[PDB]
Amino acid sequence: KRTLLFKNAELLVTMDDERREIRGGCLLVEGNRIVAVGGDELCAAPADEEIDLRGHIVIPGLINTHHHMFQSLTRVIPDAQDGELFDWLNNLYPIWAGLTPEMIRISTQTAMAELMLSGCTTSSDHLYVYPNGCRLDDSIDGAREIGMRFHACRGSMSVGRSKGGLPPDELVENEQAILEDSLRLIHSYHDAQRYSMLRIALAPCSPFSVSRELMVKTAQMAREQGVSLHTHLAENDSDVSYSQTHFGMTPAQYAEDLGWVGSDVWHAHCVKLDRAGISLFARTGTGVAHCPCSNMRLASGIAPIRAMLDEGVSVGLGVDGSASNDAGNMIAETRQAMLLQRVGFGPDAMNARQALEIATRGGAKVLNRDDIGYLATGMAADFVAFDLNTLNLAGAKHDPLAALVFCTPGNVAFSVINGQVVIREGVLQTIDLPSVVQQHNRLACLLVN
Amino acid sequence: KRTLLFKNAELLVTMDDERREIRGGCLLVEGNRIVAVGGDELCAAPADEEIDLRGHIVIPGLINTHHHMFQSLTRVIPDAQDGELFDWLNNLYPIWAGLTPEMIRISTQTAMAELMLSGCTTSSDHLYVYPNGCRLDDSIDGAREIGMRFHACRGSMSVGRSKGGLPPDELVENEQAILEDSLRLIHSYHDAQRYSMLRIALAPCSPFSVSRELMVKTAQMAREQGVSLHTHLAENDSDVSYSQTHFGMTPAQYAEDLGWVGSDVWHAHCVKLDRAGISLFARTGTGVAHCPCSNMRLASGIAPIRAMLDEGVSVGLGVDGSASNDAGNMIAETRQAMLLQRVGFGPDAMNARQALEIATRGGAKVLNRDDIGYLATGMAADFVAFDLNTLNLAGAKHDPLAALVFCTPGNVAFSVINGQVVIREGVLQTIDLPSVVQQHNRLACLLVNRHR
Ligand SMILES: O=c1[nH]cc(F)c(=O)[nH]1
Ligand SMILES: O=c1[nH]cc(F)c(=O)[nH]1
Numbered sequence: 001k002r003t004l005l006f007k008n009a010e011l012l013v014t015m016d017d018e019r020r021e022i023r024g025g026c027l028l029v030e031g032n033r034i035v036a037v038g039g040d041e042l043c044a045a046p047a048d049e050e051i052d053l054r055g056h057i058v059i060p061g062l063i064n065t066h067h068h069m070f071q072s073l074t075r076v077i078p079d080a081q082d083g084e085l086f087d088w089l090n091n092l093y094p095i096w097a098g099l100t101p102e103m104i105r106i107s108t109q110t111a112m113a114e115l116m117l118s119g120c121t122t123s124s125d126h127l128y129v130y131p132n133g134c135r136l137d138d139s140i141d142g143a144r145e146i147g148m149r150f151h152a153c154r155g156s157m158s159v160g161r162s163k164g165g166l167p168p169d170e171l172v173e174n175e176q177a178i179l180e181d182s183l184r185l186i187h188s189y190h191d192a193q194r195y196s197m198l199r200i201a202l203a204p205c206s207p208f209s210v211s212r213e214l215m216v217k218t219a220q221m222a223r224e225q226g227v228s229l230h231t232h233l234a235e236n237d238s239d240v241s242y243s244q245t246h247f248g249m250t251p252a253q254y255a256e257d258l259g260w261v262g263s264d265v266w267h268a269h270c271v272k273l274d275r276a277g278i279s280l281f282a283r284t285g286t287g288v289a290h291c292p293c294s295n296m297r298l299a300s301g302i303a304p305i306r307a308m309l310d311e312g313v314s315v316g317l318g319v320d321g322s323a324s325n326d327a328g329n330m331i332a333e334t335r336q337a338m339l340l341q342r343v344g345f346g347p348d349a350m351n352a353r354q355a356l357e358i359a360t361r362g363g364a365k366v367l368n369r370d371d372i373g374y375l376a377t378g379m380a381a382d383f384v385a386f387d388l389n390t391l392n393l394a395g396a397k398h399d400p401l402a403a404l405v406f407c408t409p410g411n412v413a414f415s416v417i418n419g420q421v422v423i424r425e426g427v428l429q430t431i432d433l434p435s436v437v438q439q440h441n442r443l444a445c446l447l448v449n
Numbered sequence: 450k451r452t453l454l455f456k457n458a459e460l461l462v463t464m465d466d467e468r469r470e471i472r473g474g475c476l477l478v479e480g481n482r483i484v485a486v487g488g489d490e491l492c493a494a495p496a497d498e499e500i501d502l503r504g505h506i507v508i509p510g511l512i513n514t515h516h517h518m519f520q521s522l523t524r525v526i527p528d529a530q531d532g533e534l535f536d537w538l539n540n541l542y543p544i545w546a547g548l549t550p551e552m553i554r555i556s557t558q559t560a561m562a563e564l565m566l567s568g569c570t571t572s573s574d575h576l577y578v579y580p581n582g583c584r585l586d587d588s589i590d591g592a593r594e595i596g597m598r599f600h601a602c603r604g605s606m607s608v609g610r611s612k613g614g615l616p617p618d619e620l621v622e623n624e625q626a627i628l629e630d631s632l633r634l635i636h637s638y639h640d641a642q643r644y645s646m647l648r649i650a651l652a653p654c655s656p657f658s659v660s661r662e663l664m665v666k667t668a669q670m671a672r673e674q675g676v677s678l679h680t681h682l683a684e685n686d687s688d689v690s691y692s693q694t695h696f697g698m699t700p701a702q703y704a705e706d707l708g709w710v711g712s713d714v715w716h717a718h719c720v721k722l723d724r725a726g727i728s729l730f731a732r733t734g735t736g737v738a739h740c741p742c743s744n745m746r747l748a749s750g751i752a753p754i755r756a757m758l759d760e761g762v763s764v765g766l767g768v769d770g771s772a773s774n775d776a777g778n779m780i781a782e783t784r785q786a787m788l789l790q791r792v793g794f795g796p797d798a799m800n801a802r803q804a805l806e807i808a809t810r811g812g813a814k815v816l817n818r819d820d821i822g823y824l825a826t827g828m829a830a831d832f833v834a835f836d837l838n839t840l841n842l843a844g845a846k847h848d849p850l851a852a853l854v855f856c857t858p859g860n861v862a863f864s865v866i867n868g869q870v871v872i873r874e875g876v877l878q879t880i881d882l883p884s885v886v887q888q889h890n891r892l893a894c895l896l897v898n899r900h901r
């Protein structure tokens with residue numbers, strides 16, 4: 001088995017059970033997993049490759065828990081930059097009706113590359129449109145080429161124009177076809193073993209874009225197959241009113257009534273989750289993907305993340321799709337979580353270590369994994385290093401960890417995912433990034449024009 | 450005088466009176482000024498150097514209107530990261546008491562380098578501590594090394610611990626000495642001419658950090674000398690209560706009472722400015738430096754920027770000191786202004802072009818300058834270029850301008866300040882940046898290990 005030693009980090013942030021932050025720390029890797037973490041004599045360990053991390057901070061790889069990677073082809077569309085969410089959807093859906101399998105494959109790589117260079121080693125996605133023969137398989141193909149640990153969601157919608165919804169009919173599917181494809185994807189791709197690089201989750205776009213029968217049947221299938229459940233919930237005032245008018249229930253009551261609570265469930269946004277919903281989520285272990293930049297850029301609101309954390313809700317972090325952020329920058333999203341909670345709820349609402357915990361342990365938690373999210377013996381070899389001697393962090397070496405959240409760092413210097421060194425001295429190793437960016441921009445131009 | 454042609458930008462954002470955004474745009478420069486702005490007809494122009502900007506967006510240089518660059522030596526101090534503003538001040542003041550002239554000279558270069566690589570071509574600063582023989586001269590020396598267009602404020606404090614204030618006495622000054630040094634700095638350094646690289650403003654830290662007499666005499670001096678006035682105003686709930694309690698007045702009423710209104714005045718933050726204060730500022734031309742990251746990082750609040758703009762208030766942008774942001778990233782601050790107004794006031798509150806106008810034309814206005822802030826014949830040759838073919842902007846070429854605000858771009862590819870190409874292919878040309886960063890971090894270490 002291949003061994004790898006990362007030695008003499010200026011600070012090794014473990015996020016482990018003691019929250020050890022080790023000066024001069026070293027990390028010994030064998031295959032895809034961590035052998036030991038420490039300073040002192042472990043730094044003298046022989047290894048097939050040694051990488052010198054003096055002057056760097058090492059953190060556990062960031063974990064992104066919500067995205068729509070296909071939207072990285074359609075950032076800052078003029079008719080979608082401003083205005084109401086109604087106009088945003090109505091101007092973007094006809095564009096997305098042109099998506100091809102190749103664009104799914106390429107856009108997954110582009111969005112994952114942006115996340116990887118900004119500190120992220122595991123990401124979910126929420127692909128929920130399948131025009132022109134597009135399949136989740138195309139996104140899985142792209143993810144496999146770039147080497148990121150991947151939770152692929154079988155997103156779905158069934159309520160289109162003919163049934164009184166907003167999406168064009170060409171962007172919705174029959175519900176029997178959705179369940180059959182969901183089952184196929186689990187059988188073909190879901191790896192439930194420790195250190196899995198690919199897991200499947202089932203994800204109707206929202207409880208309102210599919211039938212209530214399909215929400216219950218999806219939950220049933222996920223529980224039978226041992227996979228997770230993901231959807232958008234309580235993202236804005238319109239979601240809350242819709243739930244009340246149409247079902248006589250708050251969004252959280254609606255989720256509970258469908259069986260969409262539990263540690264195998266995580267809901268994106270939850271900006272308008274109420275006190276009873278927070279408590280329900282806390283006692284059922286239901287997770288939340290917090291997407292601060294999206295919630296600001298779409299004027300959704302400030303999610304009550306501090307209140308959720310204070311009751312024991314499992315909270316992870318997500319960038320959301322690139323047409324509603326529009327960046328894909330994980331460490332910048334972690335910064336935004338801290339800034340937004342403080343402006344919303346005061347100076348004690350979120351510090352650097354609490355935000356970074358959401359970005360690491362919190363994300364592992366809401367994806368229902370205990371093998372990622374911190375650095376210790378037997379954990380997955382997922383971690384990143386930032387150079388502390390850059391201009392961006394000059395004067396911030398008083399606390400290298402806080403520097404990543406309070407300052408604006410550049411790209412990571414190194415990234416390791418499943419023991420593979422995927423970024424070396426700021427250069428992505430698993431793909432030809434300039435070629436992918438070129439193809440992406442040509443495809444984006446073809447799609448929109 | 451040297452001539453420069455910048456040709457074939459994918460998009461040249463002028464911010465001019467017609468807000469032209471020119472595909473294939475070109476810029477012809479002579480010395481410190483723009484000779485022409487146009488399309489490919491400019492390619493027939495002769496120039497000493499041509500720079501090919503295809504694949505790039507060019508924008509007017511961003512203008513930063515509030516800072517404390519000395520704080521770039523003390524980012525994320527553990528005891529100041531969290532807690533109340535009281536704890537922030539009382540844990541940072543003893544550290545700043547060890548500042549030396551060399552630290553002022555170096556920290557100015559570090560803070561300006563961060564601003565320049567993130568799109569900024571003009572900055573003010575608000576140095577308000579002068580321990581151990583430090584002088585505004587030291588900051589001016591650093592700014593002259595790096596080539597940034599500079600509005601240096603003689604900040605001041607006189608109400609210390611022994612007199613019932615929070616700063617220690619070693620960090621406050623006698624008020625007559627403050628006025629004397631203010632006049633010396635104006636006479637020695639303030640260049641009032643077009644395309645000036647150095648202007649002086651007078652800047653008591655807040656209306657409560659000095660006597661009422663110093664507030665009034667400082668304004669009197671500034672008006673006599675023709676320079677501007679700068680201070681912190683209405684940053685938080687404590688500022689509003691204090692002025693109401695001690696003076697029976699809102700912060701903006703108190704500023705008016707002190708004579709601290711007018712187009713030669715700009716107030717930092719104004720988070721808690723009320724409707725009548727907004728109206729007052731609009732009709733007097735009083736400016737505002739909006740500091741969104743600082744206002745969130747210190748839990749100050751969401752300033753009513755959309756309301757001020759709708760009433761006619763001149764609003765610029767500021768990163769604030771690096772101990773309350775803690776970044777110095779001008780284009781990221783522009784993004785934050787847009788994100789924060791939307792979450793505060795709805796989807797119509799601020800778009801990419803509105804935010805970029807605050808960061809350019811808005812900053813020129815609050816600094817009382819008509820020669821920077823947009824690209825047109827006779828304007829200062831201050832502009833920057835971002836590469837549009839980066840991973841960060843992939844899929845955003847549908848609107849190159851909005852991409853700068855809605856995405857998170859890297860450093861600029863090129864920067865021109867006063868006609869000098871100060872950043873070339875991402876590399877800062879005017880200082881040895883890794884050497885300055887090394888010295889900065891070493892001085893930061895010496896500073897925090899001082900005996901106190
Ligand atoms: O912000 C968003 N809301 C709803 C959606 F379906 C989506 O893709 N993005
Ligand atoms: O936010 C701030 N408040 C007060 C200060 F003196 C300062 O520098 N910054």
Ligand SMILES: [Zn+2]
Nearest residue numbers: 067268320321
């Ligand atoms: Zn989403």
Ligand SMILES: [Zn+2]
Nearest residue numbers: 516717769770
């Ligand atoms: Zn300030």
